[PDB]
């Protein structure tokens, strides 16, 4: 009944370029591995990366990955170019309504 | 098998406070009533207003509605508020991977 809850973290990061970066986010039940991770650059609509916990997007680089299940599940990115400087966001999908995560905001120093 | 393309338009607005907004998404295909129009604010995570191409979300004021079938869609802002300036996006849920329109960006003259 009560929309799924979304538990993402951090709400925001810092890291230098070939930094091991890796976001988590912990969901209220076992949405399953109904779980879509966006990107999205400043003013562009939302890039799909990743769906079902972990098969990628088209064209998508191979840095992003993502696994899990159940409540708890990981988006890691390898290495971290200049060009992933971004929002990134989650969204269930395992009921209505489709919930999305706070979002981390990578940042770089 | 490919991705449903979902075309948003307009791609960008301005208008008055009392203005009556109307926004509309032409789908690829019989998107069914598989749609959620989100609002985004600067610096914030995407708001879902509507889902189902038609019912308001909670807490969403009257203002906003939405309706349509198939493959076009409408959303309308009744009046607009100066709370109302943000870029609006739309996605199908109707099949994998859930597509997110362009976005439509609300501002005010």
């Given at each position: 009944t009560p929309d799924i809850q979304m538990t993402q973290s951090p709400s925001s990061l810092s890291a230098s370029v070939g930094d091991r970066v890796t976001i988590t986010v912990q969901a209220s039940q076992d949405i399953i591995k109904h779980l879509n991770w966006y990107?999205?650059?400043?003013?562009?609509?939302?890039?799909?990366?990743?769906?079902?916990?972990?098969?990628?997007?088209?064209?998508?680089?191979?840095?992003?990955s993502g696994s899990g299940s159940g409540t708890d599940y990981t988006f890691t990115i390898s290495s971290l170019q200049p060009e992933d400087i971004a929002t990134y966001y989650c969204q269930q999908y395992q009921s209505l309504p489709y919930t999305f995560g706070q979002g981390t905001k990578l940042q770089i120093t």
């Open positions: 990107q999205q650059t400043p003013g562009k609509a939302p890039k799909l990366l990743i769906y079902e916990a972990s098969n990628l997007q088209a064209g998508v680089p191979s840095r992003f």
